[PDB]
Amino acid sequence: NDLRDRILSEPLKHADFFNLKELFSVRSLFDARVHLGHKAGCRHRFMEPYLFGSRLGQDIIDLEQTAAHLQLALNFTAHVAYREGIILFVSRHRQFAHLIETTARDCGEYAHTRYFKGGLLTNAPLLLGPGVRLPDLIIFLHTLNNVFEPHVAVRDAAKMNIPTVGIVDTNCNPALITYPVPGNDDSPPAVRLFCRLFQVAISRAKEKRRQVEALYRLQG
Amino acid sequence: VESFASMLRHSPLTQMGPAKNKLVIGQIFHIVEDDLYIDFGGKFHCVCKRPEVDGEKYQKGTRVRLRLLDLELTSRFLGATTDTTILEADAVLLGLQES
Amino acid sequence: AGSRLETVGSIFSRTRDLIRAGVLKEKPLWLDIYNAFPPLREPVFRRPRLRYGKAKAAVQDIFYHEDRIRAKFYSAYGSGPKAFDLFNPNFKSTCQRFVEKYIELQRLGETDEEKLFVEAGKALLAEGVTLRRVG
Amino acid sequence: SNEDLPVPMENPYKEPLKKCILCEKHVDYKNVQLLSQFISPFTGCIYGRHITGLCGKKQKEITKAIKRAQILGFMPVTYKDPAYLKDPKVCNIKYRE
Amino acid sequence: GKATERADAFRKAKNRAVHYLHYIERYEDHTIYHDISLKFKRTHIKMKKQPRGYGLHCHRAIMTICRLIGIKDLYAKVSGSVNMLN
RNA sequence: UGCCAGCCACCGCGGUCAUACGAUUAACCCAAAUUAAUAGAUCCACGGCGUAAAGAGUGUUUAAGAAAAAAAAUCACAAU
Ligand SMILES: [Mg+2]
Ligand SMILES: [Mg+2]
Ligand SMILES: [Mg+2]
Ligand SMILES: [Mg+2]
Ligand SMILES: [Mg+2]
Ligand SMILES: [Mg+2]
Ligand SMILES: [Mg+2]
Ligand SMILES: [Mg+2]
Ligand SMILES: [Mg+2]
Ligand SMILES: [Mg+2]
Ligand SMILES: [Zn+2]
């Protein structure tokens, strides 16, 4: 009881509890092309503070701000995996969809990279089952769908008070996302690096939860 | 620790300048029976047609040469707030890695 | 049960206000983690209005004096015979070699652009690279 | 202290603006050949911008110079003058398919 | 809540009202913080802060809503269309 | 009783089962007063003018105003 309150409140006093700062770097993102975006006419109006500048009509995303967002995003994902939460990966993009799905299969967390049905997060008991525990966190690797509209599950998670981590490009909407990271979701090295960082974050969180659980067991 | 402006200053894409008439080597990562999906490494893959000569030696992982015209094909039509990306690049085949 | 209005405020503000009111008796774990680790920006809904009038964007164009040298290089000699390799981070182009030797030559105190360009071309020719120019 | 920031200069790679056929040139009503190149051979009509391809200034000057030559008696109306039939074709209209 | 039968519409409205909830900040739990004047569509609503002793001079819908919130003292004046949903 | 007799401030009701007409029972609200009529008090715009009432067919000028912080007049083409 009190020791369970201790094991829940222990990682919240340490900023670097899961030691994720050594996972990535500015050169690591730059070699995997996170700093590129679409054309300057495609720039959404909410991406001007997150844009460093424009290189010959092409948007350049500031990876200092991307790393500053991504440290907090990975730390939040690690803590929500530590507290035994339900984590859902969503990316409506048919070029990596098998790779998101295999990524979630190796993570042990769940994925919806197919068509999102309309009343899924909202009208959960009719679609899924009589008593269904809602997801505790969603990562959007792509916040846009195939017809270049913002994703339905972002709005549905905002309705259902479900926190999210979203990779927003220069044409995306970071307004509804509580933890956005301004980055590139089109280049395969960037997408694979984001999947690898979320993989090692989930694995580190679950293994550290197991070790502190074993420490709690050997305490008494 | 290197700053990000220094890395932008020495990136090859900054050294590219214009995207028109640039000779860039690329790598093919997916084979469709007439369509070659080539990742030249900038942002997007380009799609080319298989040439009638030496068409057997264009496989997965094969390195080719390209002449870039547009790094991303994107236009404005009337009645559109935002431009229409095609999520592709425009490049034509010259040959494959003459060595 | 909850607050499903999208435009009122952030999910954090809605959850803390409903628990402060007393309708929600089960505290979410993500609320405590949010109290620990806040974002840079609070997720409040903002309507994406379109920009009219004389107002434009604040995005600056990325340009350099090195790009000014690259413009004259691409005007005179065009693209380099080495082609381009974007997979190597340390790729040194013939264009960037011309830029570096242009910088090293203007460090000698020559102001004239014609003299700088001619001696940069002959310094390229002394290093063995080929300048085909444009016919 | 950071010298790697971009400078607020203009674009160095601006390729210069594309020019019309008679651009930095001088039009006239006395030369029948130049005015009659932009005219349909079978009917005598004057081609528009989408066939001719000029700056609007030169398109208006060609139109006025032709019409002055039509009224003043220097060039035919109903047909192209057949002595200048074999001139090089600048227009993009294709009559034979 | 809209249904063919009045009782069905009542039940649908009761079940849908708990999904949409606000929290209304009340200064010393009886009155609102400051004077609020607004125009939503074609309805002009001006509500004024009052002291402790004189309570709820409002339109009857506003009186019902303020009683369900917990606001005991308010002034309210509505102008233009007095549509209930607006 | 059955668009008859009739009632009403407005919406309106009475066309053989009227809580609206007439009577009876009951009920509500005032009270040595209660209704009807007529005058008053109050009530229109510090709001609007594309589609609902409203930008007068156009320009210049007198009277009357505002000049509040900073500049400008001026070039292909079918004015008369
Ligand atoms: Mg994209
Ligand atoms: Mg009747
Ligand atoms: Mg009567
Ligand atoms: Mg009867
Ligand atoms: Mg009555
Ligand atoms: Mg009666
Ligand atoms: Mg009025
Ligand atoms: Mg009218
Ligand atoms: Mg008018
Ligand atoms: Mg009139
Ligand atoms: Zn011209």
DSSP string covering chain E? ---SSHHHHHHHHHHHHTTS------BTTTB-SS-EEEEETTEEEEEE---SSS--BS-HHHHHHHHHHT----EEEEEE---S--
Q: Does E23 touch chain C (CB under 8 A)?
A: yes
> What gap in Å lies between CA A47 and CA A51, rounded to an integer?
6
Name the residue among D86, C93, B44 with its Cα closest to residue A42: B44
Q: Look at the block and give the residue holding tokens 């040959």.
A: B95
Check whether residue D49 has its CB closer than 7 Å to nucleic acid strand F. no
Cα A77 to Cα A16, A70, A174, C127, D13, distances in angstroms: 13, 10, 18, 54, 45
DSSP E strands, chain B: 22-31, 35-39, 45-49, 63-70, 74-75, 84-85, 90-93
Name the residue among A216, A219, A203 with its Cα closest to residue A82: A203
Q: Phi first, then psi: what are they for B48, rounded to 5°? A: -125, 165
Scored b (16 or more CB within 10 A) or e, A16-54 reads ebbebeebbebeebbebbbbbbbbbbbbbebbeebbbbb
Check whether residue D64 has its CB closer than 7 Å to nucleic acid strand F. yes
What's the CA E80/C1' F51 distance, rounded, in angstroms?
A: 20
Q: Are A181 and A188 in contact (CB under 8 A)?
A: no
Q: Are C96 and B13 in contact (CB under 8 A)?
A: no
> What gap in Å lies between CA D8 and CA A183, rounded to an integer?
25
Contact A58 B44 (CB under 8 A): no
DSSP E strands, chain A: 36-39, 51-55, 58-61, 87-91, 110-112, 137-142, 164-168, 179-182
Q: Look at the block and give the residue holding tokens 């309210």.
A: E76
Q: How far is C-alpha E86 from the chain's CA centre?
A: 11
Contact E21 C23 (CB under 8 A): yes
Q: Which is it for strands A137-142 and A164-168: parallel, antiparallel or unpaired?
A: parallel
Contact A56 C62 (CB under 8 A): yes
Q: Phi first, then psi: what are they for B58, rounded to 5°? A: -95, 100
> What gap in Å lies between CA A83 and CA C34, rounded to an integer?
13
> How is residue B93 written in tokens?
């085949």
Question: How many separate domains does chain A show?
Answer: 1
> How is residue A217 written in tokens?
């067991």
Backbone dihedral region for residue A137 (phi beyond 0: left; psi -120 to 50: alpha; all else: beta): beta
> How is residue E41 written in tokens?
């569509």
Q: Kindly report the number of other CB atoms within 10 A of residue A119's CB atom.
A: 10
What's the CA E7/C1' F17 distance, rounded, in angstroms?
A: 29
Radius of gyration of chain E (CA): 15
How many angstroms is the resolution?
3.5
> What gap in Å lies between CA C85 and CA B25, rounded to an integer?
6
Residue C57 C-beta-side C-alpha neighbours within 13 Å: 21
Name the residue among C28, C27, C29 with its Cα closest to residue A79: C29
> What gap in Å lies between CA A216 and CA D94, rounded to an integer?
87
Q: Are A48 and A182 in contact (CB under 8 A)?
A: no
Q: Phi first, then psi: what are they for C83, rounded to 5°? A: 60, -160
> What gap in Å lies between CA A153 and CA A159, rounded to an integer?
9
> What gap in Å lies between CA C113 and CA C76, rounded to an integer?
13
> How is residue D70 written in tokens?
């039509």
Q: Does D43 touch chain B (CB under 8 A)?
A: no
Cα C135 to Cα B69, C75, C78, distances in angstroms: 21, 12, 11
Q: Look at the block and give the residue holding tokens 């720039």.
A: A43
| Domain limits for position A41 | 1-220
Q: Are B56 and B96 in contact (CB under 8 A)?
A: no
> How is residue D19 written in tokens?
């020019």
Cα A111 to Cα A132, A197, A205, C38, E76, distances in angstroms: 16, 16, 18, 26, 51
The coordinates were experimentally obtained by cryo-EM
Cα-based angle A199, A204, A205 (whole degrees, multiple of 5) = 100
Cα B66 to Cα B12, B62, C106, C118, C127, distances in angstroms: 16, 13, 34, 30, 27
Nearest-CA distance C112 → chain A (Å)? 28
Centroid of ligand 5 to alpha carbon of A45 (angstroms): 62
Nearest-CA distance B47 → chain C (Å)? 18
Q: In 3-state terms, what secondary structure has residue A208?
A: helix
> How is residue A135 written in tokens?
């997801």
Taking CB atoms and an 8 Å cutoff, what residues of chain C touch D4? Answer: none
The amino acid at residue C40 is: L
Q: Kindly report the number of other CB atoms within 10 A of residue D51's CB atom.
A: 13
Q: Look at the block and give the residue holding tokens 């082609």.
A: C83
What's the CA C50/C1' F31 distance, rounded, in angstroms?
A: 70
Is A5 assigned to a binding site? no
> What gap in Å lies between CA A138 and CA A136, rounded to an integer?
7
Q: Phi first, then psi: what are they for E48, rounded to 5°? A: -125, 145
Check whether residue D67 has its CB closer than 7 Å to nucleic acid strand F. no
Q: In 3-state terms, what secondary structure has residue B97?
A: coil
Show which subunits contact A, needing at least 3 CB pairs below 8 angstroms. Answer: B, C
Which ligand is in closest contact with the Cα of A91?
Answer: 1
Taking CB atoms and an 8 Å cutoff, what residues of chain A touch C61? Answer: 53-56
> What gap in Å lies between CA D39 and CA D85, rounded to an integer?
11
The amino acid at residue E35 is: D
- Residue A36 has its nearest CB partner, among B19, B43, B82, at B43
Which residues are found with C-beta within 5 Å of the ion, ligand 11? D 20, 23, 55, 58
Q: Kindly report the number of other CB atoms within 10 A of residue B52's CB atom.
A: 6
Walk across the sheet containing A51-55 and list its strands: A36-39, A58-61, A51-55
Q: In 3-state terms, what secondary structure has residue A169?
A: coil
